[PDB]
Write a protein that binds this ligand. Sequence first.
Ligand SMILES: CCCCCCCCCCCCCCCC(=O)O
Ligand SMILES: [Cl-]
Length: 135
Amino acid sequence: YFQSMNKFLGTWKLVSSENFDDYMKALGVGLATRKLGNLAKPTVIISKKGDIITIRTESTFKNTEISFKLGQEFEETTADNRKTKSIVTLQRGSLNQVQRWDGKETTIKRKLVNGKMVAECKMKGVVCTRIYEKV
Ligand SMILES: CCCCCCCCCCCCCCCC(=O)O
Ligand SMILES: [Cl-]
């Protein structure tokens, strides 16, 4: 008995964001960029072709896209142009992404709560919560 991330598949629209400014600060994002980041209301599209999962983020300010297999480290360029070594895992219904770069670490845990996808973003004790609804 192995679970899957099929429940994450689809198109997701940001409906709420809490503490994103301080999470961006902790990541090293500069003020002008945080201002635009805070105003962004992205769409996130999670798809899967065979073993390969893709997470595409679309906003006016920044589009990003990563493609990966579960549990295999990949190189990632983030929305704020960090170049990280990343791994996405599935832990008891939660799709967990860890990004490491320059001896630093941040985690984005995405889980489903009453049909909404909730992304918890952590960097050195700063926690940001972002809520998405399925389109
Ligand atoms: C497209 C996202 C907002 C744009 C702001 C760019 C500068 C900082 C963003 C980097 C961290 C993004 C983490 C998003 C987590 C998520 O909700 O999927
Ligand atoms: Cl397929």
